[PDB]
Enzyme design. Structure first.
Site, mmCIF file in Angstrom:
data_model
loop_
_atom_site.group_PDB
_atom_site.id
_atom_site.type_symbol
_atom_site.label_atom_id
_atom_site.label_comp_id
_atom_site.label_asym_id
_atom_site.label_seq_id
_atom_site.Cartn_x
_atom_site.Cartn_y
_atom_site.Cartn_z
ATOM 1 N N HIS A 74 0.813 -1.215 0.000
ATOM 2 C CA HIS A 74 0.000 0.000 0.000
ATOM 3 C C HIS A 74 0.869 1.300 0.000
ATOM 4 C CE1 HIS A 74 -0.053 0.005 4.551
ATOM 5 N NE2 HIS A 74 0.038 1.319 4.339
ATOM 6 N N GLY A 97 1.435 5.968 9.556
ATOM 7 C CA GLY A 97 2.849 5.837 9.253
ATOM 8 C C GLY A 97 3.551 4.729 10.015
ATOM 9 N N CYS A 139 2.838 1.761 9.452
ATOM 10 C CA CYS A 139 2.755 0.661 8.531
ATOM 11 C C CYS A 139 4.164 0.266 8.106
ATOM 12 C CB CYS A 139 1.857 1.036 7.360
ATOM 13 S SG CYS A 139 0.169 1.481 7.863
HETATM 14 C C1 Z26 Z 1 -7.106 3.776 5.290
HETATM 15 O O1 Z26 Z 1 -5.750 3.370 5.477
HETATM 16 C C2 Z26 Z 1 -5.407 2.098 5.111
HETATM 17 C C3 Z26 Z 1 -6.252 1.217 4.440
HETATM 18 C C4 Z26 Z 1 -5.789 -0.038 4.083
HETATM 19 C C5 Z26 Z 1 -4.488 -0.387 4.386
HETATM 20 CL CL1 Z26 Z 1 -3.905 -1.968 3.953
HETATM 21 C C6 Z26 Z 1 -3.643 0.475 5.052
HETATM 22 C C7 Z26 Z 1 -4.105 1.726 5.451
HETATM 23 C C8 Z26 Z 1 -3.266 2.599 6.354
HETATM 24 C C9 Z26 Z 1 -3.522 2.181 7.790
HETATM 25 O O2 Z26 Z 1 -4.473 1.465 8.102
HETATM 26 N N1 Z26 Z 1 -2.647 2.701 8.677
HETATM 27 C C10 Z26 Z 1 -2.687 2.642 10.078
HETATM 28 C C11 Z26 Z 1 -2.246 1.554 10.830
HETATM 29 N N2 Z26 Z 1 -2.293 1.476 12.167
HETATM 30 C C12 Z26 Z 1 -2.800 2.513 12.825
HETATM 31 C C13 Z26 Z 1 -3.282 3.690 12.204
HETATM 32 C C14 Z26 Z 1 -3.840 4.774 12.923
HETATM 33 C C15 Z26 Z 1 -4.329 5.863 12.266
HETATM 34 C C16 Z26 Z 1 -4.302 5.925 10.883
HETATM 35 C C17 Z26 Z 1 -3.765 4.906 10.151
HETATM 36 C C18 Z26 Z 1 -3.228 3.757 10.784
#
Ligand code: Z26
Ligand code: Z26
Lengths: 304, 304
Positions: free
Chosen positions: A41, A143, A145
């Protein structure tokens, strides 16, 4: 004595943390040898995260589009490929700080340490478990990720988890290091059913053995149960059914305390039916399921 | 989202961990620059640990008696001195892995990460707090003496704690890096009164702000209180009295949630008088006091 939610030391894994930028999106990558593993992603902007065609989005990108930074030094990307939900960015330099490593897919109910990272820089380490429903209850922000979960067997680092998604339910979803999502999750911005989660019974029993070892013995009773009777209770209280393999795994903790595994089940059965009555076990007012029997033996023995 | 008992990354502190042997006794030492800091009880055998005359015991030792091993390499000790309850062993080599460091004495109620070590080798890292009564509830075994507590401000490591003793009460006692014991403890094998411990009220309030940030809002009520009324409750429930400084420290978390600090005190007051009623706040069935307001802002913002 004392019982802490101890995480493995994160040094070996810190030496592998890099920042990966692709377009406007920046996230974390794992540099081991001449390869940087990161969530796919990274090639998505916010608009196409709703339903992205990753094969199509990766086609408009070339090696020069993957900005990999190992702290302050830029890494030259000489190759790229998509494996399941991870991108493998081959770099012309092998990480001088590469530890002995393995990529392992852990079983649901197993525990690991997570090194949370933002911009390839670490912020903290916490011990957690892979829930029976393949989700993790992490502490992650935007971030984070690309932050990885791992285990350390003396000098070898068994990488088990790459962080990807935060489900709308506040729980986290991720993959093994081959890009395979744990659970039914996909990397799309869509609400996803995580499914019914249960309590990891073997880990609760293990934590009860760690309580007896560390002085907390109030919950010990003069009763015993069978696996059959125990499981009737375990189903009602949404606990994983205890199998003979679980009992054998609890063998070492049962030999250290001299308390039979079905005798410990009777204590758990009574605690499940009566509650803690305002008391605490190892400074906790609930039954803890995030310590496997291996973690309890390791912490109470001193494995370095 | 999510709230974990997160510890600082331990890499910077792993590079400083050495093994120190003196006679039959082996424990951990901290190598920063050309000096190895370790507890002075390394010069004691089991017999003289009852009431040792450390000045007298150190006199029968010379530089060649302090076996310092940085992993597998032997360190040449060219000088030795006793500072309070620590021994400073000057070595002819400066630790190539010395990070930017400070030695700080933390206030009771402050938190830090501990890297548990056995034979100079690390085993795990856990986040913990210095209790109001200067004891720590760690997870320590024999030979964990010399394990250090620390904080990390971006790249500087503020070393705050060296581990020394396990009190017969199962709680741990240690010193700052100048050999000064936190609390009334001495380094003798004698039962020692740790004193009355209270709950760190400001940290519980901070953890309540971290709950509201992360979705848990059931405990929020339509009431408010004064510092005066709150402290009447706090004394009965053996909580630290909340001062105006605590309120100002909670300013940032109060501005992030829009919930006045005395409004949060009313929620705490009601939870103290009514209990959790079988509910949980941030996956805990008790009020958590091991997260300072700085930790909550850092974890909920993402300070690396
Ligand atoms: C809509 O964002 C997506 C959709 C699908 C995929 Cl696979 C990845 C993402 C990014 C994501 O979820 N990041 C985060 C992972 N942990 C915590 C988070 C807390 C706040 C914001 C994002 C956070
Ligand atoms: C009697 O041993 C004394 C007396 C005084 C002092 Cl100053 C130091 C020591 C050594 C010590 O307490 N070690 C330990 C520190 N943490 C946990 C321990 C768990 C088991 C055994 C020892 C543990």
């Amino acid at each position: 004595s004392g019982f802490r939610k101890m995480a493995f030391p994160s040094g070996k894994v810190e030496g592998c943390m890099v920042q990966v930028t692709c377009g406007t999106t920046t996230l974390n990558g794992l540099w081991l040898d001449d390869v940087v593993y990161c969530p796919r992603h990274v090639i998505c902007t916010s608009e196409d995260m709703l339903n992205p065609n990753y094969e199509d989005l990766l086609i408009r990108k070339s090696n020069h589009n993957f900005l990999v930074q190992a702290g302050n030094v830029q890494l030259r990307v000489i190759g790229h490929s998509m494996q399941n939900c991870v991108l493998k960015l081959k770099v012309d330099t092998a990480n001088p700080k590469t530890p002995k490593y393995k990529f392992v897919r852990i079983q649901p109910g197993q525990t690991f340490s997570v090194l949370a990272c933002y911009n390839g820089s670490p912020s903290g380490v916490y011990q957690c478990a892979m829930r029976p429903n393949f989700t993790i209850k992490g502490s992650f922000l935007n971030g984070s990720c690309g932050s990885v979960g791992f285990n350390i067997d003396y000098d070898c680092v068994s990488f088990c988890y790459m962080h990807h998604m935060e489900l709308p339910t506040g729980v986290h979803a991720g993959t093994d290091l081959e890009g395979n999502f744990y659970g039914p999750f996909v990397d799309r911005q869509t609400a996803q059913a995580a499914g019914t989660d249960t309590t990891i019974t073997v880990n609760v029993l293990a934590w009860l053995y760690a309580a007896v070892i560390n002085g907390d013995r109030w919950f010990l009773n003069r009763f015993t149960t069978t696996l059959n009777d125990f499981n009737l209770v375990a189903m009602k209280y949404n606990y994983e059914p205890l199998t003979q393999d679980h009992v054998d795994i609890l063998g070492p903790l049962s030999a250290q305390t001299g308390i039979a595994v079905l005798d410990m089940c009777a204590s758990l059965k009574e605690l499940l039916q009566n509650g803690m009555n305002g008391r605490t076990i190892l400074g906790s007012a609930l039954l803890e399921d995030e310590f496997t029997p291996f973690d309890v033996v390791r912490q109470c023995s001193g494995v370095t």
